[PDB]
Amino acid sequence: MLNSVTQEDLKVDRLPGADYPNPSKKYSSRTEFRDKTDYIMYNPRPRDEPSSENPVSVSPLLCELAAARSRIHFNPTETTIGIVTCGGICPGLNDVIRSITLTGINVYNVKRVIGFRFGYWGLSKKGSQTAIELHRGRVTNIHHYGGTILGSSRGPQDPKEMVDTLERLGVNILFTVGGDGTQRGALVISQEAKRRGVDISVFGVPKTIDNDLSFSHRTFGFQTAVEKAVQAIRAAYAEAVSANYGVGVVKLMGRDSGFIAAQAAVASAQANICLVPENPISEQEVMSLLERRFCHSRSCVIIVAEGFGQDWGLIDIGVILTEKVKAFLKANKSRYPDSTVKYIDPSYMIRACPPSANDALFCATLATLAVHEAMAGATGCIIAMRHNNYILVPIKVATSVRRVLDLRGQLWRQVREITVDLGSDVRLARKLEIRRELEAINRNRDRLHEELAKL
Amino acid sequence: LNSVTQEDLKVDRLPGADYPNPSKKYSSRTEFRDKTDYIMYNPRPRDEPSSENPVSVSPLLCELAAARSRIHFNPTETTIGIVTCGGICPGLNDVIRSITLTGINVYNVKRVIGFRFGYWGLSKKGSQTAIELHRGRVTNIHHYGGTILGSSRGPQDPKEMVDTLERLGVNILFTVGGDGTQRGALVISQEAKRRGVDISVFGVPKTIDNDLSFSHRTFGFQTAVEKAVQAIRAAYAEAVSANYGVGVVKLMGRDSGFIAAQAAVASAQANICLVPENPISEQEVMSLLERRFCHSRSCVIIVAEGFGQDWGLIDIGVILTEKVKAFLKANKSRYPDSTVKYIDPSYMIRACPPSANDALFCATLATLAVHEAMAGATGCIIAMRHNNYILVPIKVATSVRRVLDLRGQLWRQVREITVDLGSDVRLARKLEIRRELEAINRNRDRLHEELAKL
Amino acid sequence: SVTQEDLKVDRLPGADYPNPSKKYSRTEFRDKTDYIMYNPRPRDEPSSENPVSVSPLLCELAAARSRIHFNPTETTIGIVTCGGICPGLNDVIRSITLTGINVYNVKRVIGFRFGYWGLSKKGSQTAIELHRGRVTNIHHYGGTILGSSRGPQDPKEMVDTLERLGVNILFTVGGDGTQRGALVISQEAKRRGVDISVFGVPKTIDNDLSFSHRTFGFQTAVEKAVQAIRAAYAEAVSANYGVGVVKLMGRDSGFIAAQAAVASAQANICLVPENPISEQEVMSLLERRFCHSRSCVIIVAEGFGQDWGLIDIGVILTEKVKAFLKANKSRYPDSTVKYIDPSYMIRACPPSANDALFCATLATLAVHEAMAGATGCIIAMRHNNYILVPIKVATSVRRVLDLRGQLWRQVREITVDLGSDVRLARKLEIRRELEAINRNRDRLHEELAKL
Amino acid sequence: NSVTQEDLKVDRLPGADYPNPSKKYSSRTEFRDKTDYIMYNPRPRDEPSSENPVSVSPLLCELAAARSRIHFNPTETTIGIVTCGGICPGLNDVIRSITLTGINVYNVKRVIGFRFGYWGLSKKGSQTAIELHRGRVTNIHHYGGTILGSSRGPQDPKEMVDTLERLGVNILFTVGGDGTQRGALVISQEAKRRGVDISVFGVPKTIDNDLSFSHRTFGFQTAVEKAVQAIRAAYAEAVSANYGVGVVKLMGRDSGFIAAQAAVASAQANICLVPENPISEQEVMSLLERRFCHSRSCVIIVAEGFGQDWGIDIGVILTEKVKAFLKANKSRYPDSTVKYIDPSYMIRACPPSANDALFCATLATLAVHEAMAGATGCIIAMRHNNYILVPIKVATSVRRVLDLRGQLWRQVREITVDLGSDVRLARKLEIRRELEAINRNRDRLHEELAKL
Ligand SMILES: Nc1ncnc2c1ncn2[C@@H]1O[C@H](COP(=O)(O)O)[C@@H](O)[C@H]1O
Ligand SMILES: Nc1ncnc2c1ncn2[C@@H]1O[C@H](COP(=O)(O)O)[C@@H](O)[C@H]1O
Ligand SMILES: Nc1ncnc2c1ncn2[C@@H]1O[C@H](COP(=O)(O)O)[C@@H](O)[C@H]1O
Ligand SMILES: Nc1ncnc2c1ncn2[C@@H]1O[C@H](COP(=O)(O)O)[C@@H](O)[C@H]1O
C-alpha cells in the first residue's frame, strides 16, 4: 500500500506558467529564491554497508521541498487569497489564519484575503454572505486564544456551488485547513475549477491533532495536545499516589492512532500502562499489568487512547476500562483493600487552546511556505514535515493511507522502557532495590555521625 | 569542515560483548540490534530523479542509537556514575532521573552514583559527597529546575578522577555538559584505557544554545524558546501601550542566534532580530527602527547576548537600549513622548523544568545513552539529526561549533516577519488602507441589512 | 442561634514556657487574646460616638503567643491528611514541619499515612519521620506525600497510638467528617488526662466552611476551572450555534462554578445547587442567548439538578441541550454541543502563588496556636484576618452561595437575563458598531489623502 | 491619619431622577434605597460584654452597590475611559468590564476610549479616541497592556473638559495612580465650575498595593505569581552551586508588598529586603554568612526601593557587594557563585491571574453602577473583603507601606534567616531528627527484605 507508492504519486501539480517575478524584498538578494525544484529522500537510510562511494537510499522516492520561488504563477497585486477552516478545532488554527494573511499582505502585497466562515458551508451560496475581509489589523492578536475566528463545520458542500463562489469573489488561491475529508473535497474543487478553465490553486494545510498523516512526522497542534495530556496525567498520578492501591485512568484523543497517548506517556514520566489501538490486548492482559504494578508499588497510572478496545462492548473506553478496573479490584479486596480508581477525561481541553511556542513556530512556518508555493502555482497538494524539512505532497497519495504507531519504531520502544513488563522477576528486582536503598541509608548514617562529631 | 571523513564518525566500542541484553521491556528478542544501522548525514540527492534510487550529496553515515542484542558490561556487577557540569539547563533532573531508572528498571545495574558539583565530585576530597541514586531518590526530581547533584565549571586532574572511578567500581560515567566537559570526558576515557581499566565515558550534550554540530536539537533549547516568548510578550505589551514604544529583549546566544531566531518567530511579535552571525551597525539598526515607525507606533527588538561585541563580554542589552533612547531623544520632533522598555529574562529561560516535548527528548536521550554505554560505546555523545537519535565521537563533535545558516530555512522565516529596507512602505500602507476600507464597507452593509429586518 | 460561648476556643491548662522564637523583640508576641467582630457593619447611622456591630459575636484572632503550653524540645507534632486531595496539601505539611522545626525546635514531626488509618495500630507502622530535608521540594507537586483515606477509625485505638509515639499535637487536615472525628480524639485524650492538642486545618476545595470567606485550594480550583471554560468557549464560538458545557465540582455549594463563571468572563449560564431551576428555564436562557449570538457557554456545579432523574448532571444536561436543539433544527441548523468534565484536574495540582501564601500562613499560625495550647478548633479566614473557631460550631452548619450576596449579583451581570428587550438591545448595539465603522472610514480616507 | 468621617463622605451629583433599568437581578428589592457602611477598623475597643462590640476607629467607609435610582438617563449617557501610567495586569479586563456593564446592564448610548492617557482628552489627541462597542472588547482580556495606550503626562483641565463637553461624555473612568486621580479630581471640579453634568470616577492602578483605605489593588496578586517564577529560577541556580546565591530584584519603589508576598509564596526565600526596613550592607552579609553556616545556597529578594543610602539599581549594587564579600572570604566559601535575575516588566506586562480577572471585572462593574448612581471625585477600593468608595482627596493624601509589626511581615521573618537562634544547637537537633528517620527506614527495609 505504502510500498505501492511511485515517484509519480509524489509529483506535485503546478498550474501552467510562472510569468511574474517574486516581489519579496524580505531576503538579502534574489539568489535566495529557487530557480528549480529541490528534493529530499523519503528514506535517508543507506541500502548497502558503508563503501568508498556515497550512500544510496533504501527507497526510490524523493519528496519535493517547499521554498519561495524566483518565478510565481499569480500576479500578486491582482491575487485574492481565500481561507477556510473545517472539522474539529486544533491548537494553532488562529496562528495559521494569521500567518497566511500576513504572508499574503506583507510579502506578496496581494489585493485581498477572504475568510470563509464555518467550513465549506462558508463557500455555499447562502454561506458566502458571511465571508469576512482579513486585513492586517484584523489578525494582529488572534494567536493569543483557541478556536478559529472563521469557525468550522464537518459537512461537505456542492463542489459546483463552491467553485461558483470562488469565481464570483475572484479568489485565485483557496487554503483548505482540515483533515483527509476536507483535503479530498479540496482536490474535487481543484478539478472542478480546471474543468471550467478557471485559474485557481487549492492548497491544503493538514489539520489532525492525532499526528496520523502519512509522508509526515509532525502535524500542527500535536505537541500542544501532548503538553495538555501531560497536565491530565500529572493530576491522575497525584490522585493515584495519594491512595493506598490508587489507580489513575486518563483517556486521551486517538481514534485510530496512539501518537498522543504514547508521547504523553513518555513526556509525563509517570505512566505505568499505555493502551493504543495499534496494540489491542485483552481486559485480562490489562488487569495482569495492574496486578504486577501492585506487587511492589501502591499506585498505577493507565493512559488509554479513545480508539483502544473497541471490541470490549464509538463506545467510551475510558468509562468501560474504569468500571472493569473497579470490578477487578472489588473481586480482590483481600489483596488490595480500600483501593481507589480516579478517571480523568480532559477531552476538548487538549485541542481548544492556543499552541505551545514550538507549535506557534511550526504553524507560522507551514502557513508562510504554503503561501510561497501556492503563489508559485502549487495546487492539489498539502504542506507537511518529514526529517526536519518542509515538503509538498499531492492530496491523492496523502489521503490514500492513514499513519499509525510503528510497534517496532523508536517511540513505542521508549513507551515500553517506562511501562510495566510481565517478563522480569519482580521479587529479585525489589530485593536489589532494597540493597540500593540500604546503601544510601548507611552512607547517610555515616556522613551524619561524622558531621555530628565536629558539632 | 567539509574535510570530515567516515573515520571521524566511527564510534569507539570497548572490546567484547560477552553478555546477552537482559531487557524484558520489548515483545521479543528480535527488537534488539544484531549489527550497527546507519542514517545519511545529508538526505538530499546528488543527481535529479532517475530510474535508480537516489544518492547522498555527502559520503558521511552517522551511527544510529538503539538497544543491542549483546552488551559489554555484566549488568548485575555494573556501577553507573553521573556528573552534571557547567550552567544548568531545563531537563537536567529529567536526564539524571532517566539514566538512573533505565540503569535500574531495564538493566538491573548494581548501583548508580551521582557525583556532586561537576568534575569536582570525582576529585578525592569531592568524592565523599557523592550520593546513592536509588529508584525512590529520583521519583519527583523532574518537577523542578537545576541539578540535584549540583554543577561547577572547573576541570580536575584526570588521574585523580580515574582513581575515584576505580575505587568506587564505576564502569560507566555519563558526562552531562558542554564541549569543555566532553573534551575532559574523552581525556578520562583515554586515561582509563592507558591503565587497562574497563570504563565507558559517555556524553549527554548540555548546551541550551543548540550550537552542537552533527545535531539539529539539544535538550532544553525548546524550553528556553518557550520562556524567551514570555519575555517578548511582555516587551510587546509595554511597547504597544506607548505612542512610539520600543521593547528590547536580550536572550542567551553567546556565539549563535538559535534562541533569538526561534523566539522571534514563535512570539509572532518581533520587528528586529539581532544575532552574532549577522553583524550590522548601530546606524543599520536605527534605520530598521525608523522604518517600522513610518506606519506603526510600536517596535520589538530581540538581541542575542553575542550580537554587537564591536559596539564598545559587554552587555549589548543595556548598550542597545541606551543607543535607541539616544536616537529617539535626537528625534523628539518625529517621535514625541517615545518610550524604551528593556527586559533581560537572563537565567529564567534555563533555570526551570522542561516543556513536555523537552521531557520526552531528555528521557529518550538518557535511555538510549544507557543502552549504548552498556553495549560498550565510549568517547562519544548522543545527538539528534533528521528526527533520529545518533552517536558521534566527542573528538569531531568538539572540533566545530554550529551557527545560524543565514541562507537556511529558520533565518528565512525570521526575515519574513521582521522589517526590510527594500519595500515601498508608503505603497504598502496605501494598499492596507484599501483592504481595511473594503472590510469596513462589507461590515457596514451587513449591519444596515440586519438593522432593516429589526 | 450562635452565642459568644459557641466561639470560645478551648485552651489546654497552663502556659508555663516562654516562646523560644528568635524570628521577631519580645513585644511582638501576644500577652492576651485579641478579637475581631464577626460582622463589621454598623447597627446605627454615622454618629459622634464610634460605630457598633450589628452582631454581638467576636472571633478569636490567631497569633504567636508570649507564653506557650508545650515544652518545645520535648514536643512531638503529628500530621494526618484525610479525604480527597486539594491544591496546597503538601504546602501545609511542609509549613507545619518547617514552623515546628525552624521556629519552635520541636523534638520530632511524624506524618501518619493514608488518613486516620495511619493512627490505627496496624497503620502506625507506616508513619514517616518529617525532618527538614524530607519536605524541601514537596510543594512543587500535587497530592499528599502522606496519602489519604475517607474512613474513620476507633478514637480509643488512635489515642493509644498518640500516647505510644509521644505525640503532643495532632494536626488534622480534612473536611467536616475529619474535624468531627478530631474533636472526638481531643475529648478521649482529655478523658484519660493525656496532654494532647488536636488542631484542624480545614480542607474543602468547595469553600463551604461557615465562619470563613476562603479555604485553601479554592482559588487554585477556580484557576483550573477557567482553563476548562476557555476550551468550552473556543469549541462553542468555532461552531454556528455552538454550545460549550463545563461541569465543575460543587456537591452542595456553587462557589467554584460562580467564581469560575465571572473569572472566565466567557460564561452565559451558571447553574448551582442553591438556585434550582427547571430543564425548561435552562432551555429558555439558551434560546435567548441564541437570538442575537451564535455561541453559548453553560457552567454547571455537580450538585445542580439532582431532581432531573449521585447522577451525572454534566452528561444529563448535555443530552437535554442536544435533544432541545435537534427538536429546533429549523431555527438552529447544524448546531453542536461540546461537554468538558475537568473533574480531578482542578484539585490534584500544586497551588496558585496566592494559595501557596495562604497555605504557608494557615499552617504557620496553626503551629503557633497549638503550641500555645489551642485544641478542638480550626484556623480560618474572615475579613482578611486569620481566626480560630471551635470545631463544634464550624461543623454544625454548611456555607452556601448567598443568592442576594455580592458574588451571585456579579454572576447575573455577565449571564443572560429573561427581562430585557433583545431586539431593542441589538438595535442599539448595531448603532454603536456603525458609529465605530463610520469614524474609522473617515480617519482612514483622511490619512490616505496625505500619503 | 488626622482623618475624619467628613473626609470619607463620597460626593454625589445632584438628583436621582431615573429608575435602574438593570433586568439582571431577580426583583427590584436587590437594588439599594440608601447608602450602607462598613467599619474602617472592625476590631473591638473593650473585651466581650453583654452589649454589641464597638470599633476602635470612629470611621465608616461607604459600600459600593447597584442603586434603585440613578443620576444619569441611561439611553442618553456616554461613558469615557482613559488609562494612564505604567501598564498593570488586568488593564484590558477593566476596559472590557466598564464597556460591557455600560452596554449589557445600563444600555448606555456610547462608550469612548481616550488613547495614550490624559493626552487622549487634549484637543489634538481626541481625534484618536476609539468607539468601544461590545464586539471590540470581546477578546482583549487574553493579552497584556492597554488597547487604549498610556502616557504619564498631565494635560490642561480646561482643554480636557472642553473635549468631554464636545463629545457628550457624562462619566469619565480614570484608570491610573495617585497622579492620575489628583488630576481626575481637578477635571471633576472644572466641570462643576462650568455647571456641566459629569461624573469623574477612579479605578486605582498600582501594582505595588500601596493604596490607603485598601488591602488589595488589581494586578498585585498577578505580579506576585510572576515574581515567584523569578524566585524559582534564582533558587534553581543557587541550589545547583556549592555556596550559590540567587538575587531577585522586584518592583517596590516605596513599599515591599510584592517582595514580601513573593518571598512567602515562593517558600524558597532566605533574605527579604524592603524599603520599610533599611539595614546595612554589613547586616545583609551577616544574614548571608549565617545561612551558609549549615546550608550551601541562599536566595535574596530585594525591592527596587531598598538601600537607596548605599551610594540607583540596588539589584546590580547588591550583587556586586555579595560577590565582593564572597571573594574577600574565598577560604570559607570556595568556588562560590552569585546569579542575579531582574524580571522587571515581565511581572506587570501580562494578562491577570484568574483571581485578578474576577477582581478587575467586579471593580469595573461596581464602578459603573456607582457612577450611573451619581458618585464622583472618588475611587473604588477593597477592604476586609468588601468593595467600598473613598474620595480621591483622602486616598491621595497618604501612601500605604508594610506594617513591620503586621501579619505578612511576621510570616516573612518565620521563613527567613534570624541572627538570634543557636545554629550549632539547631543543626545538632536536625541531625537527631534525620538519624531517627534513617533508623526507622533501616528497620522497615530489613523487615520487608526478610519476607522477600
Ligand atoms: N527510563 C525512564 N524514563 C522516564 N521515566 C521513566 C523511565 N522508567 C520509568 N519511568 C517512569 O518513572 C516512574 C518512577 O516511579 P516508580 O515507578 O514509582 O519508581 C515509573 O512509574 C515510570 O512511570
Ligand atoms: N509571516 C508571518 N508569520 C508570523 N508572524 C509574522 C509574519 N509576518 C509578520 N509577523 C508578525 O506579526 C506582527 C503583526 O503586527 P503588525 O505588523 O503591527 O500588524 C509583525 O510585527 C510581526 O512581528
Ligand atoms: N460586566 C462583565 N464583566 C465581565 N465579563 C462580562 C461582563 N458582562 C458580560 N461578560 C462576559 O463577556 C462576554 C462578552 O462577549 P459577548 O457576550 O459575545 O459579547 C459575555 O458573553 C459574558 O460572558
Ligand atoms: N514556615 C515556613 N513556611 C513556608 N516556607 C518556609 C517556612 N520556613 C522556611 N521556609 C522556606 O523553606 C525553605 C526550606 O529549605 P531549607 O531551608 O534548606 O530547608 C527555606 O529556605 C525557606 O525559604
Residue numbers in the entry:
A (entry chain A): 20 to 332, 346 to 487
B (entry chain B): 21 to 332, 346 to 487
C (entry chain C): 23 to 46, 48 to 332, 346 to 487
D (entry chain D): 22 to 332, 347 to 487
Task: Quote the study's own text.
Sequence comparisons of Trypanosoma spp. and Leishmania spp. show that divergence of the two genera involved amino acid substitutions that occur in the enzyme’s ‘reaching arms’ and ‘embracing arms’ that determine tetramer stability.
We also show that Leishmania PFK melts at a significantly lower (> 15 °C) temperature than Trypanosoma PFKs and that addition of either AMP or ATP results in a marked stabilization of the protein. The dramatic effects of AMP on Leishmania activity compared with the Trypanosoma PFKs may be explained by differences between the T‐to‐R equilibria for the two families, with the low‐melting Leishmania PFK favouring the flexible inactive T‐state in the absence of AMP. Sequence comparisons along with the enzymatic and structural data presented here also suggest there was a loss of AMP‐dependent regulation in Trypanosoma species rather than gain of this characteristic in Leishmania species and that AMP acts as a key regulator in Leishmania governing the balance between glycolysis and gluconeogenesis.
